Design a protein around this ligand. Sequence first.
Ligand SMILES: *[C@H]1O[C@H](CO)[C@@H](O)[C@H](O)[C@H]1O
Length: 478
Amino acid sequence: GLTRGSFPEGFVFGTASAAYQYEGAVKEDGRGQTIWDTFAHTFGKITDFSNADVAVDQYHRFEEDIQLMADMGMDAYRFSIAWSRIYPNGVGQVNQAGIDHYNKLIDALLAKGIQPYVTLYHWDLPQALEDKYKGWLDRQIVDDFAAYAETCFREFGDRVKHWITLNQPHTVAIQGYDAGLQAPGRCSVLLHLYCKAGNSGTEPYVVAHHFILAHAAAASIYRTKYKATQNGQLGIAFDVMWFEPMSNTTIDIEAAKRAQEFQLGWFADPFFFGDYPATMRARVGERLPRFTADEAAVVKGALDFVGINHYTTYYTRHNNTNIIGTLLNNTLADTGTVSLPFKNGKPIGDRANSIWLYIVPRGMRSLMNYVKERYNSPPVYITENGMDDSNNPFISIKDALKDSKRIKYHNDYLTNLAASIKEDGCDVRGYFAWSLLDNWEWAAGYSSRFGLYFVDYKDNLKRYPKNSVQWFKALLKT
Ligand SMILES: *[C@H]1O[C@H](CO)[C@@H](O)[C@H](O)[C@H]1O
């Protein structure tokens, strides 16, 4: 079946990680508090009462983990820099120990022939900026993020040639500010009583606007000051569910397209065309910010590549609502759609551990074609794809390693990806499995095991290879 030969020469295979989910050492070497330290230490926010204070301790164990990557023949590793290790208070005094740590990590990767693909922002905003101005809700975040990015370009860009400014701005806008299920946990209290403050109808759009501007500000710095010498590239990782119409009818086909425009187009249309999708302007109206002429000119073209984080495909139908009015405005109502993994009483596919993660390999190919067609064939990396096992205390570790479902998932999604490149002409350059290790899965805590390696939380975080490790090693062989 699949081999490296199934993909273009030079195609990059990696695994992905994120600082807060992996590093631990949350108070070590001057690290500043982040919104996720606060959130994980707040009652009710994490389903299994857990936090990432130690996580899988990659802060201390990265050399071990790098050898695990090399064991499989991985080309690359996607990891994030914790902003609060570099600027513990978001701005001001740089923390030299943070710079030193990530230099050691980058050098240890390169020593093993593994290329670093670095995410600047993977959700862990320094708490000091949240306290000062409510973080992404204030335009000041644009300058502060750009200054932090510049520091990273200056310190690491001689070696780091692939930068992901932001991870899943759509997820952050919706989960952090509409549903209030992720940090900082804001929403309309009339929609969800557990939130302390917010507005599900307005705040997600403000946050998204600031993400877009923050990327463009960092990209402007990179292009003007670093890119010529460093010869690297900058992109963003978008979370993108594929949507299929719930019926093959004009109304539902149009609904599926609209759902996609509200998910990916919300961010990608500015970066390619210099404004939000027309459907969003029509439906969100005055709650959707407007770019100035000068902003649009810095935003349009600001990506070198499109990172796609994709897991699943849902069915989408048209939806007519009338809801009061301002008080219950929210982003799902704004889309005029409903999406779910069920049609005519049947699931769209098998499901992984996560209650949202339906196994639909064809969606990978459909999405690659959508991106090529809508955005004129930009370079794409799959910056995240994979699935999770449950954390099951009632089975042996040996049985937990038999991840035949994960093997079939990666096999099927990669087969579809390979076809989108070979038969469809999609410009895909690389693929990053989520995730190298089992890790702290945000509000799901330790209940979800996404790793190629099993982590024994009961035995000093010992790493054991699941069956998928051999599968990838055989795939990647030369
Ligand atoms: C991609 O999705 C995984 C699983 O939910 C998550 O752990 C990452 O942080 C996200 O970027």
